[PDB]
């Protein structure tokens, strides 16, 4: 019946040199409050931290960041200007005190972009289990990818029959570049989902991947041919097969 | 990180074996420890603390702190390939600082029972000229490589559980679009075991 922890944007594109405020409120009564950055090499580093209304200090890496503490529900990070080193996945966390267990919210994609057109919607396409395989070891394995996406705000899901499954599926954990020579490339995610061979013949069995992207918002500006990538789910789907 | 230091890993552990975990901090000022876990893409959750020194047993999980000795590590007995994720230490220093490590990403490897490595070509469910290669059921001391040409994609291996059929297989995939591609150029003689069956698509 409480919230908890929320971290408002979930996803943001931020043009270079712009001013951004993540927000982040708990309705936990929580009176600490802390703010961390997730980076692949680095793990969390701890920008501002709050111990109590009205008092906040410095953590590992405040600078180009600011906080307030005008209240015990919210703890605001602002980004003065954004530069692209602020790409980075951000971690709001509270504590009933200092020094209890911290409660972590589900985390803000920021990617700071020089140039808004470099993004780009992912294609999804599913291939069909190999008869090789079905053969070799009565088993059915699907893949599904992902491709040609920036920045890599994506969420990779299998539906079997309108249903979620997480049985049977791997997705890879980082996206690949699908030009590593280039800073700004655009990436791809593949995903696999195997099931029974049997499960995989039945021409009821309906099997979707679909792929969440986080783009551009209703309020961004948009003057290319192409469409404007916002925020957007897109799909590819298969059905079972006896032959 | 830099008063709380971690060993970023990967650490591979074999499933059942006792995979082992440390930390260590500045002496000024720590008062409580913690060990988070953080599964790919999602949150770090508290698994355990501890603030005085010994061992503290919960389960599977046993965490030992000694503050004269300035660690404090998270064994995790039994292993499963479901522990496979971020092990974040994480330290409380007077004056506000909740402080973390690097964090090690752990990850235990399935005991393959019928190793049958094989790369199989699967196509497109859409009217198109696309393919991609599955290089599957190796065994879990297989490494994949990444790609040495920037038009081949390699993914890295990974795990899936088909829960109930008891079924764990590794697996990565690899596509090109290159005109004279195939799967073999991505899953050569660099990454597949000798006697991978690997059949012509039909
Ligand atoms: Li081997």
């Known amino acids: 019946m409480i919230a908890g922890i929320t971290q408002a944007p979930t996803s943001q594109i931020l043009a270079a040199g712009r001013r951004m405020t993540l927000r982040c409120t708990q309705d936990?009564?929580?009176?600490?409050m802390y703010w961390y950055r997730q980076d692949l090499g680095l793990g969390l580093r701890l920008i501002h931290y709050?111990?109590?209304?009205?008092?906040?200090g410095k953590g590992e890496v405040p600078d180009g960041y600011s906080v307030s503490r005008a209240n015990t529900d919210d703890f605001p990070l602002t980004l003065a200007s954004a530069v692209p080193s602020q790409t980075s996945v951000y971690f709001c966390a509270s504590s009933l005190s200092f020094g209890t267990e911290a409660f972590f919210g589900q985390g803000t994609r920021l990617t700071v972009v020089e140039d808004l057109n470099k993004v780009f919607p992912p294609e999804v396409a599913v291939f069909e289990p190999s008869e090789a395989e079905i053969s070799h070891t009565q088993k059915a394995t699907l893949v599904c990818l992902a491709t040609g996406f920036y920045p890599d705000h994506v969420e990779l899901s299998w539906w079997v029959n309108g249903k979620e499954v997480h049985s049977g599926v791997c997705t890879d954990p980082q996206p690949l570049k699908e030009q590593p020579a280039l800073n700004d490339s655009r990436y791809a995610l593949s995903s696999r989902l195997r099931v029974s061979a049997t499960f995989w013949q039945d021409p009821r069995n309906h099997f979707r991947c679909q792929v969440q992207f986080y783009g551009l918002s209703e309020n961004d500006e948009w003057t290319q041919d192409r469409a404007k990538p916002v925020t957007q789910i897109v799909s590819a789907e298969a059905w079972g097969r006896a032959d | 990180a830099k008063e709380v230091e971690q060993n970023s890993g990967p650490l591979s552990v074999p499933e059942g074996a006792i995979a082992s975990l440390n930390c260590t901090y500045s002496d000024r000022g720590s008062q409580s420890f913690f060990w988070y876990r953080q599964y790919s893409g999602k949150s770090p959750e508290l698994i355990m603390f501890?603030?005085?020194?010994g061992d503290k047993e919960d389960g599977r999980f046993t965490a030992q702190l000694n503050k004269a000795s300035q660690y404090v590590s998270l064994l995790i007995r039994d292993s499963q390939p479901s522990d496979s994720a971020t092990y974040l230490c994480?330290?409380?220093f007077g004056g506000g600082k909740l402080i973390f490590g690097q964090g090690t990403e752990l990850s235990v490897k399935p005991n393959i029972q019928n190793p049958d490595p094989a790369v199989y070509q699967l196509r497109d469910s859409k009217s198109s000229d696309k393919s991609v290669c599955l290089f599957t059921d190796f065994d879990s001391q297989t490494n994949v490589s990444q790609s040495k040409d920037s038009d081949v994609y390699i993914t890295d291996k990974c795990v899936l559980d088909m829960r109930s059929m008891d079924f764990k297989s590794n697996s990565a995939v690899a596509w090109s679009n290159k005109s004279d591609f195939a799967c073999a150029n991505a899953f050569n003689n660099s990454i597949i075991p000798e006697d991978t069956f690997f059949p012509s698509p039909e």
């Open positions: 936990m009564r929580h009176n600490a």
């Open positions: 994480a330290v409380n």
């Open positions: 501890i603030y005085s020194n």
């Open positions: 709050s111990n109590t209304a009205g008092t906040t």
